[PDB]
């Protein structure tokens, strides 16, 4: 409970949180062959 | 009930009156033979449509394309200018997006003179 408009620092952290989320949504370029143990998945990972 | 698609090829209002004249011609053809529940849209359409351009054609319609071709006005504006506010100044200012913009002095006046060549 409690709270309210407290800790402007946390507000800045909240703003950053929103900004980081927006960058992920905009994004989907290599990814290479990494960690794939499946030949079927590795073929699809080529593109 | 099942729908096979959102929207087919765009139909403006010309042939509406033309093919509702066929719906006219079929049942009672209104005013002439005056001497169900389809009367709702029947009397409604023909009244609003015709009264506009009075105070139409056959060939010149399909021949109106000529200078309406070279223009980049695309689609949304194209089938729209057929009826509303023809051939005076700020009339067409509203309908077309970006409006005057690119070409101003002469070329747009070529639109006014030809759409004034309607009636």
């Amino acid at each position: 409970p409690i709270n309210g408009p407290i800790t402007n620092k946390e507000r800045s952290l909240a703003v950053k949180y929103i900004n980081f989320g927006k960058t992920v949504k905009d994004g989907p370029x290599x990814x290479x062959x990494x960690x794939x143990x499946x030949x079927x998945x590795x073929x699809x990972x080529x593109x | 009930m099942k729908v096979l698609e959102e929207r087919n090829a765009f139909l403006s209002d010309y042939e509406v009156l033309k093919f509702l004249t066929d719906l006219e011609k079929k049942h009672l053809w209104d005013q002439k033979s005056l001497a169900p529940e389809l009367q709702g849209i029947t009397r409604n359409v023909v009244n609003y449509l015709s009264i506009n351009k009075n105070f139409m054609s056959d060939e010149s319609f399909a021949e109106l394309m000529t200078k309406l071709n070279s223009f980049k006005l695309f689609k949304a504006e194209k089938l729209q200018i057929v009826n509303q506010l023809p051939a005076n100044m700020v009339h067409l200012y509203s309908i077309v997006e970006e409006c005057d913009a690119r070409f101003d002095e002469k070329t747009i006046e070529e639109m006014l003179e030809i759409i004034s060549g309607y009636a």
């Binding site: 800790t7 507000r11 952290l13 949180y17 980081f20 989320g21 960058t23 499946x38 | -």
Partner: protein, 539 residues
């Protein structure tokens, strides 16, 4: 009436909907499908995704697969059968969605604890660097270094890179690091059951000692592999300064992020019970010793196997002795007022932190003093939990909670006397206490053998049940919080799209400030109860 009270969504989604809610904000649609189904049905197979949902077969599955792999949202395992072929089963991976729920909170501690330097270009630099890390989910050094602009200082961003490895935080990508704890234990359990050349059928109990002891030492090398390794990071070729391996990639870690907030919980308890100075003296100690302190990592053997009835302690105390070992042996000898941003020796301020021990810390060995990570948790869970009832209900609810915790399992006879004042109001808050669990009810009749009324009653124990009810506070708080924030989007979606294209009118700017207000405050409420939940996830 009208259902707007949200009674519809209230009953049917404990845990569950939490996961696919967060990934919905992350991605949505197909992404929420697979994970949501991965939870409900648990262990899942590639072909099995197609059968259930009819999810647009093989177009979405192969797309979502690699999408969940880069951010490692799925626990991957592959094996075979005695019949033949091969099989690949997926699990819900650790908590990777909680990290997505974290995000900037992690980067917060990253920025804040990166000082001992002073207000440098580091702020705008690593903010761009770290945000590129978590987003992609994996970062190779060279390909990332290629993203840096040319004709400038290349080691400016590498001024802190080898400083990103630091002590905790970012570590290297290694092999099987993502893997079910149950499965890796079983896979490592091979060469143990398998090992004997028809030795001898004597003392069957020696097969126990054989497999176990050999598994424990093989388990230790695996878990300590990501923990501390100086090979890759400390590489220092000539014609330069220390530079991390351009080949080996990196990843963030649970180590010092889960530690940083855990210390805060200790600080909040400290600061409450002592002065601001004492909290600082206790802080400078924890900052140096947090590296070798298991803390959050404590059980590490718990998930994936049995404990015992008999041998439970012989398991537990085996961990407790190594929880005795490392803190006692390794940790720092007495220092004097190390650096800091009161002259002479500050150990006198430790002595006032010494003479007063209860509830917490102050465990001393001759020659060396340190805070136990074992006996500290019970008094840590006590305080915070007691403050919860303090916040939610009035003062009356508090007093009775400990009254049951002083002695154990007694009737209302000595309770009415020894509690505070009045019968009727006690019965009132007794019903409010017994309202949701946590005191249970006793089991015994008075000379009726379970028959009828007037039997004796007692209030007793039930810790975990008085725990898990704080685990129900996890999702359903954040749920409506995040949901109606997301519902605030689609409602204003027509406005937001107009705002984005603009980046006019009196009333358009009004609702623009509206949502932004609600946005800010709702994220502040999120992080609030976020810190509350994190302390309740253990013991």
């Amino acid at each position: 009436v009208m259902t707007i009270s949200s009674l519809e969504q209230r009953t049917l989604n404990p845990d569950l909907f939490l996961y696919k809610e967060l990934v919905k904000a992350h991605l949505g649609e197909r992404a929420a499908s697979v994970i949501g189904m991965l939870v409900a049905l648990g262990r899942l197979s590639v072909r099995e995704l197609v059968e259930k949902i009819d999810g647009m077969d093989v177009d979405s599955v192969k797309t979502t697969l690699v999408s969940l792999t880069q951010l490692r949202c799925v626990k991957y395992l592959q094996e075979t059968a005695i019949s033949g072929k091969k099989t690949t089963y997926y699990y819900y991976n650790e908590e990777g969605i909680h990290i997505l729920l974290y995000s900037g909170l992690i980067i917060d501690e990253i920025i804040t604890q990166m000082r001992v330097n002073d207000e440098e270009e580091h702020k705008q630099l690593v903010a761009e660097i770290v945000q590129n890390v978590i987003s992609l989910g994996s970062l190779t050094v060279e390909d990332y270094l290629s993203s840096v602009t040319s004709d400038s200082m290349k080691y400016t961003i590498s001024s802190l890179f080898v400083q990103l490895c630091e002590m905790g935080y970012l570590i290297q990508i290694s092999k099987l690091h993502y893997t079910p704890i149950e499965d890796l234990w079983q896979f490592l359990y091979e060469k143990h059951y398998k090992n004997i050349p028809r030795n001898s059928p004597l003392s069957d109990l020696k097969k126990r000692s054989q497999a176990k002891m050999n598994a424990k030492t093989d388990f230790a090398k695996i878990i300590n592999k990501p923990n501390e390794l100086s090979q890759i990071l400390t590489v220092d070729p000539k014609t330069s300064l220390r530079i991390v391996k351009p080949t080996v990639s990196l990843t963030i870690n649970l180590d010092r992020f889960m530690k940083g907030r855990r210390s805060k919980q200790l600080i909040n308890l400290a600061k409450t019970r002592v002065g601001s100075v004492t909290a600082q003296v206790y802080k400078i100690a924890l900052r140096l010793t947090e590296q070798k302190s298991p803390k959050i990592r404590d059980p590490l053997t718990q998930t994936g196997l049995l404990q015992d009835l008999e041998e439970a302690k012989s398991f537990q105390d085996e961990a407790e002795l190594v929880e005795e070992k490392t803190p006692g042996l390794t940790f720092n000898a007495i220092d004097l007022a190390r650096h800091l941003p009161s002259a002479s020796l500050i150990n006198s301020h430790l002595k006032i932190l010494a003479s007063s021990n209860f509830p917490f810390l102050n465990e001393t060995k001759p020659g060396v003093y340190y805070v136990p990570y074992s006996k500290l948790m019970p008094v840590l869970k006590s305080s915070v939990y007691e403050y919860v009832i303090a916040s939610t209900l009035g003062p009356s609810a508090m007093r009775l909670s400990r009254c049951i915790r002083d002695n154990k399992l007694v009737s209302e006879k000595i309770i009415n006397s020894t509690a505070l004042m009045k019968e009727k109001d006690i019965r009132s808050t007794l019903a409010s206490l017994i309202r949701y669990n946590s005191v249970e009810i006793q089991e015994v009749p008075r000379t009726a053998d379970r028959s009828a009324s007037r039997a004796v009653f007692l209030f007793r124990c039930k810790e975990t049940h008085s725990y898990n009810f704080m685990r129900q506070n996890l999702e359903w708080n954040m749920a409506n919080l995040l949901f109606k924030k997301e519902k605030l989007k689609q409602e204003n979606s027509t406005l937001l799209k107009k705002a984005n294209r603009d980046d006019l009118l009196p009333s358009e700017l009004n609702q623009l400030k509206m949502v932004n207000e609600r946005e800010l405050n709702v994220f502040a409420r999120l992080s609030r109860l976020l810190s509350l939940w994190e302390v309740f996830q253990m013991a």
